[PDB]
């Protein structure tokens, strides 16, 4: 189980995190730009 967790953590979780980071930051930036003080 530890070996499997290490395997999934490095390979699949790297791709998922890298996929999510730009999407999240850009979408949140878009929402922030939407608002006007």
């Amino acid at each position: 189980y530890s070996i499997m967790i290490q395997k999934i953590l490095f390979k699949d979780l790297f791709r998922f995190l890298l996929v999510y980071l730009l999407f999240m930051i850009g979408y949140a930036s878009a929402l922030v730009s939407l608002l006007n003080p």
Partner: protein
């Protein structure tokens, strides 16, 4: 500082449940690293540790 630890542990477990607020961080220096550490703590507890428990039952 046993009393401080005793209080904070209850607060931290409550935050782990998903209810409460992290108001105690006012006395901390370098709050950013504390935020990051709590972020990673939540990520490990919810995403990886909890998921592996889910997976084990399915395969067995």
């Amino acid at each position: 500082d046993s009393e401080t630890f005793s209080t904070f542990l209850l607060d931290l477990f409550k935050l782990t449940i998903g209810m409460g607020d992290l108001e105690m961080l006012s006395s901390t220096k370098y709050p950013v690293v504390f935020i990051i550490l709590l972020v990673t703590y939540i990520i490990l507890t919810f995403v990886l540790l909890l998921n592996m428990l889910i997976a084990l039952m399915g395969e067995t």
